Motif scaffolding. Sequence first.
Motif, PDB file in Angstrom:
ATOM      1  N   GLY A  51      53.027  43.600  62.627  1.00 14.76           N
ATOM      2  CA  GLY A  51      52.645  44.707  61.766  1.00 14.76           C
ATOM      3  C   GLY A  51      53.009  46.078  62.306  1.00 14.76           C
ATOM      4  O   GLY A  51      52.420  47.084  61.916  1.00 14.76           O
ATOM      5  N   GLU A  52      53.996  46.113  63.193  1.00 18.50           N
ATOM      6  CA  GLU A  52      54.449  47.352  63.825  1.00 18.50           C
ATOM      7  C   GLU A  52      55.457  48.172  63.023  1.00 18.50           C
ATOM      8  O   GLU A  52      56.245  47.622  62.254  1.00 18.50           O
ATOM      9  CB  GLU A  52      55.118  47.026  65.173  1.00 18.50           C
ATOM     10  N   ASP A  53      55.410  49.492  63.202  1.00 24.29           N
ATOM     11  CA  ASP A  53      56.414  50.377  62.627  1.00 24.29           C
ATOM     12  C   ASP A  53      56.779  51.302  63.782  1.00 24.29           C
ATOM     13  O   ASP A  53      57.854  51.169  64.366  1.00 24.29           O
ATOM     14  CB  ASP A  53      55.934  51.205  61.435  1.00 24.29           C
ATOM     15  N   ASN A  54      55.888  52.233  64.116  1.00 27.78           N
ATOM     16  CA  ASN A  54      56.130  53.121  65.252  1.00 27.78           C
ATOM     17  C   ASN A  54      55.539  52.375  66.441  1.00 27.78           C
ATOM     18  O   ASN A  54      54.330  52.279  66.562  1.00 27.78           O
ATOM     19  CB  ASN A  54      55.409  54.462  65.083  1.00 27.78           C
ATOM     20  N   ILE A  55      56.379  51.847  67.322  1.00 26.03           N
ATOM     21  CA  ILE A  55      55.858  51.082  68.456  1.00 26.03           C
ATOM     22  C   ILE A  55      55.112  51.872  69.533  1.00 26.03           C
ATOM     23  O   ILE A  55      54.608  51.286  70.497  1.00 26.03           O
ATOM     24  CB  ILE A  55      56.974  50.262  69.133  1.00 26.03           C
ATOM     25  N   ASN A  56      55.030  53.188  69.368  1.00 25.32           N
ATOM     26  CA  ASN A  56      54.342  54.036  70.336  1.00 25.32           C
ATOM     27  C   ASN A  56      53.054  54.645  69.795  1.00 25.32           C
ATOM     28  O   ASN A  56      52.360  55.372  70.504  1.00 25.32           O
ATOM     29  CB  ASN A  56      55.264  55.160  70.818  1.00 25.32           C
ATOM     30  N   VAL A  57      52.726  54.343  68.544  1.00 27.27           N
ATOM     31  CA  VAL A  57      51.512  54.885  67.942  1.00 27.27           C
ATOM     32  C   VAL A  57      50.739  53.830  67.168  1.00 27.27           C
ATOM     33  O   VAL A  57      51.287  53.223  66.258  1.00 27.27           O
ATOM     34  CB  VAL A  57      51.837  56.020  66.951  1.00 27.27           C
ATOM     35  N   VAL A  58      49.471  53.615  67.514  1.00 21.77           N
ATOM     36  CA  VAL A  58      48.652  52.652  66.778  1.00 21.77           C
ATOM     37  C   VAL A  58      48.427  53.241  65.389  1.00 21.77           C
ATOM     38  O   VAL A  58      47.797  54.291  65.247  1.00 21.77           O
ATOM     39  CB  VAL A  58      47.284  52.428  67.453  1.00 21.77           C
ATOM     40  N   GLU A  59      48.943  52.567  64.366  1.00 14.02           N
ATOM     41  CA  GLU A  59      48.818  53.053  62.998  1.00 14.02           C
ATOM     42  C   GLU A  59      47.805  52.294  62.137  1.00 14.02           C
ATOM     43  O   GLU A  59      47.601  52.634  60.975  1.00 14.02           O
ATOM     44  CB  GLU A  59      50.204  53.066  62.339  1.00 14.02           C
ATOM     45  N   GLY A  60      47.175  51.271  62.708  1.00 14.25           N
ATOM     46  CA  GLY A  60      46.160  50.530  61.975  1.00 14.25           C
ATOM     47  C   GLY A  60      46.481  49.163  61.387  1.00 14.25           C
ATOM     48  O   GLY A  60      45.570  48.457  60.951  1.00 14.25           O
ATOM     49  N   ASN A  61      47.750  48.772  61.371  1.00 16.76           N
ATOM     50  CA  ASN A  61      48.119  47.481  60.799  1.00 16.76           C
ATOM     51  C   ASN A  61      48.649  46.478  61.821  1.00 16.76           C
ATOM     52  O   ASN A  61      49.119  45.399  61.447  1.00 16.76           O
ATOM     53  CB  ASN A  61      49.170  47.685  59.703  1.00 16.76           C
ATOM     54  N   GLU A  62      48.564  46.819  63.105  1.00 13.59           N
ATOM     55  CA  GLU A  62      49.073  45.941  64.157  1.00 13.59           C
ATOM     56  C   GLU A  62      48.146  44.816  64.583  1.00 13.59           C
ATOM     57  O   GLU A  62      46.929  44.890  64.441  1.00 13.59           O
ATOM     58  CB  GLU A  62      49.433  46.741  65.422  1.00 13.59           C
ATOM     59  N   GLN A  63      48.761  43.769  65.117  1.00  9.98           N
ATOM     60  CA  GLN A  63      48.051  42.621  65.647  1.00  9.98           C
ATOM     61  C   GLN A  63      48.758  42.302  66.959  1.00  9.98           C
ATOM     62  O   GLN A  63      49.962  42.047  66.980  1.00  9.98           O
ATOM     63  CB  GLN A  63      48.123  41.432  64.683  1.00  9.98           C
TER      64      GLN A  63
HETATM   65 CA   LIG Z   1      52.215  50.884  66.113  1.00 12.69          CA
END
Ligand SMILES: [Ca+2]
Length: 223
Positions: A51-63
Amino acid sequence: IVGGYTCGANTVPYQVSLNSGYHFCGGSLINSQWVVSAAHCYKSGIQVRLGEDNINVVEGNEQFISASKSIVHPSYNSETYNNDIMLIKLKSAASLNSRVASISLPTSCASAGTQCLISGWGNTKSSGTSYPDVLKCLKAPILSDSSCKSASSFIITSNMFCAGYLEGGKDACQGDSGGPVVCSGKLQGIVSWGEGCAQKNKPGVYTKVCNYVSWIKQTIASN
Ligand SMILES: [Ca+2]
Ligand SMILES: O=C(C1CCN(c2ccncc2)CC1)N1CCN(S(=O)(=O)c2ccc3cc(Cl)ccc3c2)CC1
């Protein structure tokens, strides 16, 4: 990805990032507990990020899920890159949704000319160095085996296929390895290798997934 475009947050739900303290390779979610990637991306202590987009910022959809077991293809040859494919089992099942979804395995190989989507967080410059933080996308056609073998300095096996542009400018690159090549909703390739990035007359070489469906299925069924 050189010469590609910003995919857009979570528009590629099956794309995963392999992390060992930092991003080092891509991968594809094939079901709630298994990821497919390249064998040359093997490493111990892998954590899978979905669920990553910006790999340097937790955006809320990651696992973030640790790998419980990694399985490099029995016949992987690191000198020839033949059979460059690896399976990774997640310690726990991923929670599937609209931003985290698996991609289907193919039932038949894809033919030359077919348009496919390649994605990754790899280097975006053919000469310099510049790594993006957000997922990059690229549309590319599968090339014929003859032009593939004709362009490559090294031996292209029956378990590989070329994709990209002979005119250079668009290609996968360092950091994209292990990533998906999807055509017609099916995972047909794995970002494997190339002689440089986006060089004229040097296309990208990919692992031909349609030749491993049997191994993949048997393996996940028994592990
Ligand atoms: Ca992220
Ligand atoms: O030329 C090479 C190696 C590539 C692999 N290799 C062989 C040798 C013999 N047979 C098959 C492959 C030896 C030379 N490299 C330069 C480019 N780098 S890279 O920038 O990290 C890279 C990595 C993966 C790529 C994947 C694609 Cl699909 C296209 C360009 C790529 C470029 C990788 C090593």
